[PDB]
Write a protein that binds this ligand. Structure first.
Ligand SMILES: Nc1nc(=O)c2c([nH]1)NCC(CNc1ccc(C(=O)N[C@@H](CCC(=O)O)C(=O)O)cc1)=N2
Ligand SMILES: [Cl-]
Ligand SMILES: [Mg+2]
Ligand SMILES: [Mg+2]
Ligand SMILES: [Mg+2]
Ligand SMILES: [Mg+2]
Ligand SMILES: [Mg+2]
Ligand SMILES: [Mg+2]
Ligand SMILES: [Mg+2]
Ligand SMILES: [Mg+2]
Length: 165
């Protein structure tokens, strides 16, 4: 199964870099917990932003612009990315915007962090039809001394499909 995992500010703005508009170590812990021991697929922009393989995960980089780094697995299409993961229970797609857009139709689960921040960026999470999904988990957290903004974790499972997403 393929899942997407993303942190969304207002207007579905995402940030892949370390310098995110927000500082949410709680969200990074959520990300790590839900991706550990699973393959992660990302585009090259996200790869360069992370800047080292995510430990404890197979790192697959989708790009028609492959780099040379031998520490990760480079693939040239969505289908090839999926094949490179093989027979695992769950493949995690970790962005960025265009990669999420291409993988959404193949995904059956979303792990979202809805962050109460309005921000400057222009990269967005894809459009999805909310009536196509069931919200099977949600948990709101207030900001605290370690986490700059309030946020709500959510897990959605797909119930319906309308082809483009
Ligand atoms: N929920 C969520 N939050 C994010 O911040 C996020 C996301 N999903 N999906 C893709 C994405 C792309 N950017 C990044 C940037 C850095 C790391 C990273 O360094 N992760 C470490 C955690 C570091 C820590 O323990 O504080 C890891 O091992 O996962 C991951 C993804 N970021
Ligand atoms: Cl990317
Ligand atoms: Mg090589
Ligand atoms: Mg299987
Ligand atoms: Mg800008
Ligand atoms: Mg825009
Ligand atoms: Mg899009
Ligand atoms: Mg779309
Ligand atoms: Mg409070
Ligand atoms: Mg229904």
């Amino acid at each position: 199964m393929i899942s997407l995992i993303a942190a969304l500010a207002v207007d579905r703005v995402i940030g892949m870099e370390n310098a995110m508009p927000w500082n949410l170590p709680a969200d990074l812990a959520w990300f790590k917990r839900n991706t550990l021991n699973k393959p992660v697929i990302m585009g090259r922009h996200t790869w360069e932003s992370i800047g080292r393989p995510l430990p404890g995960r197979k790192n697959i980089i989708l790009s028609s612009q492959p780099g040379t780094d031998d520490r990760v697995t480079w693939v040239k299409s969505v289908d090839e990315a999926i094949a490179a993961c093989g027979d695992v229970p769950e493949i995690m797609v970790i962005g960025g915007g265009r990669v999420y857009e291409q993988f959404l139709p193949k995904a059956q689960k979303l792990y979202l962090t809805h962050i109460d921040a309005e921000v400057e960026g222009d990269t967005h999470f894809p459009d999805y039809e909310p009536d196509d999904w069931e919200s099977v988990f949600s948990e709101f957290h207030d900001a605290d001394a370690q986490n700059s903004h309030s946020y709500c974790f959510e897990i959605l499972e797909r119930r319906h499909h309308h082809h483009h997403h």
